[PDB]
């Protein structure tokens, strides 16, 4: 709970992203947002830190573009300040295009640079630029021992950013963890999957994607969450102690591994159990294919493979 100062650090949503060209797959990415937006609209936080990577494109569907006006013009009539970094998708490719951030111009503020948030009430200290390019590494190390050099004299001071670290995304990475200053807080994004751990006399922060948009976040969905994280800084130091993770319900997606009835009839009672029509995704050998062909209208798509092969290997 708390506070005295309290903010939160979300990132990735992919607004206008239609997976397996899903009608409804669109939608539950604008859901997931629409609900973040529902959780950080009652906890109030003083500020909102967006590590990027809004949006999923340069040119987002109308919809994806209202509903992320709507949603942050929301967040700022209910005076809460926001940061927002831009990441890949956001980002300009020919010389003159314009982000479809600089459509939220007026209710959030794009970080390429430094400030100081006078808060309600004390001083902190943010700094945070765009999405740069493998290539303009070399470009952003000055842009972050700059940022360094003005962040000393100040107390409290955070880090935004959207790349590829190289402790974090082993390939391809933009940054090396040693690369980067220390700061009290790094809401950093373009990580699908939560991550905090402390760092360099300090919390390291990936929000992580708000929706499965692979392919992968399966089992850290599960087991951890997808979602944004509350932080507070109302006291002087920090540590994984004073960060509440919020968590955030989505499509519900099933692991199936169909070889035996054994295991058919598992995948079964996991698509009952299941609130809504789910993703069902792993193997299913051929053999069953047609059975469970049985279950189409309990199921939202079957993204599975199909193996064809005949395997020995039992268990220990
Ligand atoms: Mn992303
Ligand atoms: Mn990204």
Redesign the pocket.
């Given at each position: 709970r708390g506070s005295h100062m309290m903010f939160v650090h979300i990132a990735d949503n992919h607004l206008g992203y239609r997976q397996y060209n899903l009608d409804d797959r669109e939608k539950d990415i604008y859901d997931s947002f629409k609900l973040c937006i529902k959780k950080i609209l009652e906890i109030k936080p003083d500020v909102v830190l967006h590590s990027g990577?809004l949006f999923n494109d340069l040119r987002p569907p109308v919809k994806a573009l209202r509903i992320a006006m709507q949603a942050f013009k929301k967040l700022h009539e209910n005076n809460i300040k926001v940061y927002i970094v831009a990441?890949?998708?956001e980002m300009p490719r020919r010389l003159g295009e314009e982000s479809p951030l600089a459509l939220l111009k007026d209710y959030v503020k794009i970080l390429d640079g430094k400030d100081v948030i006078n808060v309600n009430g004390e001083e902190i200290f943010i700094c945070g630029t765009y999405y740069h390019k493998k290539s303009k590494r070399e470009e952003m190390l000055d842009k972050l021992k700059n940022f360094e050099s003005e962040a000393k004299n100040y107390k409290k001071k955070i880090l935004m950013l959207?790349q590829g670290i190289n402790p974090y995304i082993p390939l391809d990475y933009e940054l090396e963890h040693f690369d980067l200053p220390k700061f009290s807080y790094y809401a950093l994004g373009?990580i699908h999957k939560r991550i905090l751990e402390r760092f360099n006399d300090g919390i390291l922060a990936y929000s992580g994607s708000t929706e499965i948009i692979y392919r992968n976040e399966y089992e850290d969905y599960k087991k951890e969450g997808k979602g944004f994280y509350l932080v507070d800084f109302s006291g002087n130091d920090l540590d994984i102690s004073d960060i509440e993770k919020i968590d955030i319900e989505c499509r519900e997606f099933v692991e199936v591994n169909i070889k035996d009835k054994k295991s058919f009839n598992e995948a079964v009672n996991k698509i009952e159990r299941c609130k809504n029509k789910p993703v069902v995704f792993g193997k299913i050998k051929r053999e069953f294919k047609p059975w469970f062909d049985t279950l189409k209208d309990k199921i939202l798509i079957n993204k599975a493979i199909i193996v064809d092969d005949e395997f020995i290997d039992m268990p220990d």
């Open positions: 990577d990441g890949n998708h959207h373009h």
